[PDB]
Amino acid sequence: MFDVFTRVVSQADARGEYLSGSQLDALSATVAEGNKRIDSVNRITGNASAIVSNAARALFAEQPQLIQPGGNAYTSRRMAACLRDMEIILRYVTYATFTGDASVLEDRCLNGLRETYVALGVPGASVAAGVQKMKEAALDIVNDPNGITRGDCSAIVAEIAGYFDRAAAAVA
Amino acid sequence: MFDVFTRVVSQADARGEYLSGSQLDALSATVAEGNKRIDSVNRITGNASAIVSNAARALFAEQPQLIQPGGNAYTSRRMAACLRDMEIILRYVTYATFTGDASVLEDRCLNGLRETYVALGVPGASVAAGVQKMKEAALDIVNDPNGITRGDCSAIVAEIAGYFDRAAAAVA
Amino acid sequence: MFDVFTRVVSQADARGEYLSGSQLDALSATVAEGNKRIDSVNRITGNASAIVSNAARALFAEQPQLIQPGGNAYTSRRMAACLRDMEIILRYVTYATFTGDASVLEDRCLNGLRETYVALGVPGASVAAGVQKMKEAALDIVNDPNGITRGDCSAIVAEIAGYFDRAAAAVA
Amino acid sequence: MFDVFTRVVSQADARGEYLSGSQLDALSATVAEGNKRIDSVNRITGNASAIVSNAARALFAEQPQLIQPGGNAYTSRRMAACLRDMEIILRYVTYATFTGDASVLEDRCLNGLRETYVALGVPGASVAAGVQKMKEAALDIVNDPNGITRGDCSAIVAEIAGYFDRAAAAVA
Amino acid sequence: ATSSRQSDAGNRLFVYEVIGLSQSTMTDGLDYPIRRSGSTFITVPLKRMNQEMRRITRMGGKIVSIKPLEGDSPLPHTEGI
Amino acid sequence: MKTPLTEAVSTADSQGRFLSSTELQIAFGRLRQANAGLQAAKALTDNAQSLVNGAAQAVYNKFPYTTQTQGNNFAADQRGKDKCARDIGYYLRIVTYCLVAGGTGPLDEYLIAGIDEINRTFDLSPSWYVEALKYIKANHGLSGDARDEANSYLDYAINALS
Amino acid sequence: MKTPLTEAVSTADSQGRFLSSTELQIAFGRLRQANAGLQAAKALTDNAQSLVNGAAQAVYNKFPYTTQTQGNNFAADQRGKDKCARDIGYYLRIVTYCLVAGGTGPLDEYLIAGIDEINRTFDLSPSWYVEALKYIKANHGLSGDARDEANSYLDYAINALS
Amino acid sequence: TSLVSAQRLGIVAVDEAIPLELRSRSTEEEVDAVILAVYRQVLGNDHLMSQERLTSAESLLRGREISVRDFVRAVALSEVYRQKFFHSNPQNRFIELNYKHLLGRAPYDQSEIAFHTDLYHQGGYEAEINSYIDSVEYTENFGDWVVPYFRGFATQRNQKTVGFSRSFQVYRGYATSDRSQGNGSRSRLTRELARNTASPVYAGSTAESLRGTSAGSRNQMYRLQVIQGAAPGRGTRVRRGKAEYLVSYDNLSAKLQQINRQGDTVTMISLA
């Protein structure tokens, strides 16, 4: 896998060049944003169970076809598997936020996931709706101004929204 | 796998008949060139590392894009895999020479090698060129007049060359 | 596991010197003995099932308490395991005759066989009696003058008897 | 522990059968060889100190690494223990020659000797080399025609050689 | 790591098709050589699906297709014949 | 399908290294005795019909109940004799295959593997084939190294059936 | 186990010294006497079945109560008679073992040690075995140097049982 | 290990053992050899009869429908493995048997035993068996196509040094098995695995001791690993908690009486 540094390292080794001034300056800016990135990872991790439970509540409230007898998320076994799937997707989104590159999210969670959900009969649009709800919950929790020092965090929120849209698009 | 004996045994078993006189005379002829077969196997085995290193040197001499930063043979891991592939191909050509039939080479080395190289992105034309280079290196080692009893060895040289063309055609 | 050669090689490498000429002459004597050795191995292998069955029947003629209800060789399973142990001991005796050293017996056949027969409740003295009876049958098989060219084979018979006595002494 | 008679006595008692005519004839042959056996025991006992001193001198001439400062046989006490070990091994070889069975040599002297030499850091290959030198010394003294009545004594010399070989193999 | 296990429905078999199995620091751990990298087909039950996916993913393999079987038997694999 | 050469290559490939002098000596023993194996295979191919008919006659001599007891497993009718004759012909043909190959490999994949289930399911006594193979041992009439492999493959199927 | 060779080696090992001329004389006496011991053991081996049956019969003559009254320790049934014949066969076989070994070592290791606890526990009378050994003394038929060997081991077991 | 160590330890044949890999398009001989190797190693060198030979999973290998790992899993999940190693065995012994068969290893620590016991209690035998085959260690060591083999006598990347000494307590020899009389065996590691220590190896020729004139009438010694505590009478000063006693046959009953009167527990008795 790669993080925000080793992705640029792998690109430079493919090109066979040393890093220029612009790439090192971009990586230094990423290091400057790194504390905000770790704050985002900490907040989503600390409210992960709340995010998964509230997203499951809203998903099966707006889509009651899944929890009804016969629905995929019906039966405590399949429901526990669905809650595990929300927890796994949120966990790998936090992993991709931590690395700063989505290599862990593509290569470790989203690869074969669409074919998994097609072979299982899992409706991937419902999973994408749950990922959208985890996105809005996590972006509200990151952007909470209380209990943390002031600063601009539009870049990391945009990156987390990109990771969440990547997770939702891989199952849709 | 098969050798020169179990090949015609399996053909006679699939026909359900005993071996006729011409088949046994052909196998007696195979026993007659068996000593030259053992000589060829021993000479390629004894000069295998020199053959692999010289074939690699020529291959990266007139195809330098393999070793270029970003090339398929660039990075120690990829070059070690390249020399290991050369060693495996030469070893399985000696295996097929030893058996007198290309069952071990086609079934345990060339079986699935082409889509392996396709999925990795390994350029199979350059692999076939390296196999060709090991072919003239091995046939130059075999046909060295010094330090060996005189005799005609065109059949075993043609059979080794045929094994090398089966190895090169399975990767191109 | 050693043969007649690598045992002398192992003590010489432990001493750190080349083989003296007496050791080379003794190894050449074993090389000249090797045709009679391969004859003995082939004869015991060819009559292995007859040797095992005859020794089993005459062992239970000697010891009827083994197949008696409650005996160790009673019940098809235990009888079948006993018969497998008899043919395994005969097989490893052929192995030790083949190599010319008894390292395969003490390293594979008798390695923990005493502990296994104590733990299972197997009477090891009855196993040693069966090994002596297979020894008598195999020595009558090897020293049979019919169907072979003449020669003095007391050395290979004494070596087979030594392997059999070491196999019997390990379980008793 | 056993002698030549009591080994086959114990082997017959483990089977519960009387000794057959072949075993009694073999023991009668042992009784016939016993005078030469006593002669061999007497000769090795007489020249025991010469055997030990000459073989130790030859061993440290061939292996001067043992007496060098820091060597295993360096220091008077370790060298004494070395000469004591050679004398004890000779004494137990004479005991095994006297009894006609290697029960005393293997059971009282060779069992656990390899573990002791490993635990002290004693090189068991050097012990095996010294025991081998004592072997050709003892078979040179035993097979000396001078001062004794003539007769074929190859069997007792081979038996002493076997005792020395199992003494050297128990430490190598 | 799943609730599927200890269930009859968790014996539903699937076939994973994975590509790109190559040596990597993640693969440097392995004590055995890998012989194929073209298209490896693995039969996986439902209970064991989580383990297999992670294992394939950990080694860097890429999953191309997962075919359901509608059976507990691996008979419609038909790849090694 | 085991021979000297195939097991030599399999051992070297399990080692993952080249063909050392061990496998070369394996090939030398194969070359040394392959000519006698081919001569033995030629002689048994020439005498195949006579030895199969004599082996079937010896089986009927030792086991006369196969020729008089009515049953699908027995040779009381001409169908059972034809099946017995072609079974003995199979045994002799895979024996010649083992002589050609130079190992018991053709016996291992063609005849030995699964033969316990064949004799159990169709109620074939293995002692019939044991007497047939003892007739082939008694009357193949080779000498030297040709007879020694002939006794090797014959007693291999004797030991597997008993 | 106790033989002249084992005793000589045990004493020389206890003193940590080589085998002197004393041990050589021990082996010389063993060697001279061993041929008569082996001939005595051969004759007892050949006459063993008749000697054991006659010894059991002589015990039944001196002690008829062992054949009439019921009891596990008595020979009134076939099981008790088989046990008595097996016991006397054990005694005679170990006497032959002592004849071969040249000392009372087989008796001391196989029969003498613990026979008091056996005769106490299983209610066996040592007088029965004393009469059995006395019948072996009466009818072994050895003469000369071999007879004094046989009678020494038979009286050693008698003196142990009485 | 090398020749001089393995000759004393009796593990020569383990060191010259080649891991069987079922290559693609394998001949029936190679599939038969893989099946026989799996039955030898997974079923612990048991005399396996043909009546429980698992013909279905054998045909699934022959068919190439399942991998070698699947066959190992099928064999370990069968009732042959349940009868031989699970039903009559305690949990510690069964977990050690699983490690020896599936992973070719001795267990390293007590938390591994606690994890496997908790996984048995939470998910059944099937879940527990899967734990070993679907582990990172199995995939790395054997993967899909290599028959599992004993790796406890070789230097492993993530291994504990105590695993080498415990492998001799688990692997008793080449001609041994894991079957006992009545099929119920007690674990030899529970004393050390719980306490995170090791025992002396004492395997084969390692167990022997020098006899001399000190062996008694029977020229053999007996080896006693005994945990010693303070005596209530305080007659003799105890210098070590774990003590070694080498005693003859003629004093073995007396020495056992001495140890039992001292209140000390016997942990091992072997030949020497």
Ligand SMILES: *[C@H](C)[C@H]1/C(=C/c2[nH]c(/C=C3N=C(/C=C4\NC(=O)C(CC)=C4C)C(C)=C\3CCC(=O)O)c(CCC(=O)O)c2C)NC(=O)[C@@H]1C
């Ligand atoms: C010198 C004053 C006279 C002399 C000496 C001589 N010595 C030896 C042999 C040995 N000497 C020793 C002594 C020691 N070894 C030790 O480790 C220590 C303690 C550190 C001591 C004191 C030993 C062990 C030997 C024998 C082993 C060996 O050769 O090293 C010899 C050789 C004897 C032989 O037979 O080979 C000689 C000649 N000789 C004289 O004439 C001087 C008057």
Ligand SMILES: *[C@H](C)[C@H]1/C(=C/c2[nH]c(/C=C3N=C(/C=C4\NC(=O)C(CC)=C4C)C(C)=C\3CCC(=O)O)c(CCC(=O)O)c2C)NC(=O)[C@@H]1C
């Ligand atoms: C015969 C003279 C009289 C007789 C004998 C009788 N003996 C037994 C039982 C046992 N005898 C032995 C003796 C030995 N066992 C040994 O191993 C050796 C050394 C080789 C000896 C001498 C033993 C051990 C037993 C008991 C165990 C067993 O049954 O084998 C019995 C049976 C006693 C019982 O209660 O079952 C009998 C009857 N009885 C007579 O009346 C004869 C006068």
Ligand SMILES: *[C@H](C)[C@H]1/C(=C/c2[nH]c(/C=C3N=C(/C=C4\NC(=O)C(CC)=C4C)C(C)=C\3CCC(=O)O)c(CCC(=O)O)c2C)NC(=O)[C@@H]1C
């Ligand atoms: C037969 C003459 C006697 C007899 C035998 C008997 N043996 C067993 C069980 C086992 N035997 C072995 C031995 C080996 N296994 C090997 O792989 C090798 C080669 C290195 C040897 C020498 C083993 C391991 C076992 C146990 C495992 C298994 O059963 O496969 C039994 C069965 C005991 C039981 O209760 O299960 C028996 C009966 N028994 C006799 O009475 C004869 C004297």
Ligand SMILES: CCC1=C(C)/C(=C/C2=NC(=C\c3[nH]c(/C=C4\NC(=O)[C@H](C)[C@H]4CC)c(C)c3CCC(=O)O)/C(CCC(=O)O)=C2C)NC1=O
């Ligand atoms: C067929 C097997 C099966 C079971 C057993 C099952 C249980 C189950 N109960 C749920 C919710 C719930 N269950 C309750 C139950 C109660 N609240 C109370 O105060 C009462 C005391 C109590 C009733 C005894 C409530 C209030 C919720 C809603 C929780 C939420 O939306 O957050 C949910 C969450 C999803 C949803 O809203 O449907 C599941 C999956 N589902 C299944 O498929």
Ligand SMILES: CCC1=C(C)/C(=C/C2=NC(=C\c3[nH]c(/C=C4\NC(=O)[C@H](C)[C@H]4CC)c(C)c3CCC(=O)O)/C(CCC(=O)O)=C2C)NC1=O
């Ligand atoms: C390594 C990372 C990883 C991922 C990504 C993963 C996905 C995953 N989800 C699964 C099942 C499942 N996933 C769901 C999920 C849902 N059903 C719905 O209706 C909702 C739309 C949705 C939740 C939002 C369900 C219901 C199953 C069980 C399907 C079945 O039992 O038939 C399975 C089958 C195996 C098993 O559950 O044990 C896998 C492998 N497993 C992993 O280890």
Ligand SMILES: CCC1=C(C)/C(=C/C2=NC(=C\c3[nH]c(/C=C4\NC(=O)[C@H](C)[C@H]4CC)c(C)c3CCC(=O)O)/C(CCC(=O)O)=C2C)NC1=O
């Ligand atoms: C081990 C646990 C741990 C963590 C996670 C941690 C994070 C952490 N976040 C920091 C800053 C910060 N964190 C933020 C983050 C944000 N600001 C906002 O208004 C947004 C709501 C939000 C984005 C999610 C900002 C803007 C800073 C100051 C700039 C910077 O230091 O990078 C700092 C600098 C010290 C400080 O001023 O507080 C630390 C140490 N410290 C710890 O000990």
Ligand SMILES: CCC1=C(C)/C(=C/C2=NC(=C\c3[nH]c(/C=C4\NC(=O)[C@H](C)[C@H]4CC)c(C)c3CCC(=O)O)/C(CCC(=O)O)=C2C)NC1=O
């Ligand atoms: C990115 C990771 C990486 C490394 C490290 C690497 C090393 C590397 N160095 C090579 C050759 C070489 N390297 C040298 C180097 C030297 N000769 C000397 O006398 C000097 C003392 C010394 C320099 C310090 C030479 C002479 C060759 C040519 C060898 C040949 O053609 O036979 C080759 C052979 C292929 C080729 O000709 O390019 C490789 C693969 N390749 C890689 O992809």
Ligand SMILES: CCC1=C(C)/C(=C/C2=NC(=C\c3[nH]c(/C=C4\NC(=O)[C@H](C)[C@H]4CC)c(C)c3CCC(=O)O)/C(CCC(=O)O)=C2C)NC1=O
């Ligand atoms: C274990 C190692 C070992 C090997 C490998 C070996 C091989 C070997 N090759 C031989 C012959 C031979 N080898 C050749 C081979 C050739 N002649 C040529 O001019 C070509 C350059 C070349 C083909 C590569 C020929 C022509 C013969 C003689 C014909 C024959 O014996 O088959 C012979 C017969 C004895 C002799 O005349 O030398 C042996 C023993 N002997 C051993 O001990």
Ligand SMILES: CCC1=C(C)/C(=C/C2=NC(=C\c3[nH]c(/C=C4\NC(=O)[C@H](C)[C@H]4CC)c(C)c3CCC(=O)O)/C(CCC(=O)O)=C2C)NC1=O
């Ligand atoms: C409790 C499970 C169990 C079974 C089943 C069993 C069978 C069994 N039957 C045997 C022998 C035998 N069985 C027979 C049987 C027959 N011969 C005939 O002609 C008849 C047609 C037929 C009867 C139906 C004979 C003759 C032997 C002796 C074979 C020999 O000594 O060579 C033997 C050989 C050992 C011995 O002599 O006792 C075994 C082990 N043993 C067992 O422990």
Ligand SMILES: CCC1=C(C)/C(=C/C2=NC(=C\c3[nH]c(/C=C4\NC(=O)[C@H](C)[C@H]4CC)c(C)c3CCC(=O)O)/C(CCC(=O)O)=C2C)NC1=O
């Ligand atoms: C692949 C099967 C095969 C085998 C096994 C085989 C063995 C074999 N044994 C031989 C010799 C021999 N075999 C013996 C053996 C014995 N002589 C006796 O009287 C004893 C009964 C007996 C000991 C068991 C002797 C004495 C020789 C001749 C000396 C020698 O060649 O070493 C020979 C030399 C050629 C000959 O004179 O026959 C061969 C080739 N040949 C083959 O093709």
Ligand SMILES: CCC1=C(C)/C(=C/C2=NC(=C\c3[nH]c(/C=C4\NC(=O)[C@H](C)[C@H]4CC)c(C)c3CCC(=O)O)/C(CCC(=O)O)=C2C)NC1=O
């Ligand atoms: C049962 C009869 C018996 C035997 C067999 C025996 C062997 C024996 N040899 C020993 C030591 C020794 N043995 C040697 C021998 C040698 N060093 C060399 O370099 C040479 C290769 C070799 C002379 C051939 C040495 C040097 C020691 C002392 C090791 C030490 O303490 O540092 C010790 C340690 C105890 C002691 O200090 O004596 C024993 C027990 N002890 C017995 O009671």
Ligand SMILES: CCC1=C(C)/C(=C/C2=NC(=C\c3[nH]c(/C=C4\NC(=O)[C@H](C)[C@H]4CC)c(C)c3CCC(=O)O)/C(CCC(=O)O)=C2C)NC1=O
């Ligand atoms: C107490 C001290 C003592 C001893 C040891 C002793 C031994 C002894 N050795 C003898 C014979 C013998 N000794 C030998 C031995 C040999 N012949 C050889 O040429 C070989 C060099 C050598 C083997 C080491 C032979 C061949 C006989 C004659 C055969 C025999 O009597 O067994 C004899 C028979 C009488 C005679 O002819 O001399 C005796 C008494 N006598 C004693 O008073």
Ligand SMILES: CCC1=C(C)/C(=C/C2=NC(=C\c3[nH]c(/C=C4\NC(=O)[C@H](C)[C@H]4CC)c(C)c3CCC(=O)O)/C(CCC(=O)O)=C2C)NC1=O
């Ligand atoms: C937990 C981490 C860990 C440790 C500590 C460890 C030690 C270790 N050292 C070993 C062997 C060995 N270690 C040595 C070391 C030495 N020989 C000498 O003379 C020197 C004094 C010394 C080097 C300084 C040797 C020679 C062997 C091989 C012994 C043999 O195979 O015969 C072995 C046997 C297995 C093998 O050969 O791989 C182990 C397990 N293994 C581990 O996984």
Ligand SMILES: CCC1=C(C)/C(=C/C2=NC(=C\c3[nH]c(/C=C4\NC(=O)[C@H](C)[C@H]4CC)c(C)c3CCC(=O)O)/C(CCC(=O)O)=C2C)NC1=O
């Ligand atoms: C889950 C239960 C299960 C099933 C259903 C199963 C079927 C099955 N049958 C097979 C082979 C086979 N099946 C047959 C059957 C026959 N040939 C004929 O001509 C007849 C029409 C017919 C019998 C009446 C044959 C001949 C093969 C071997 C094909 C070959 O190896 O070339 C194979 C390939 C592996 C092997 O050779 O054993 C499988 C997997 N295996 C299982 O485990």
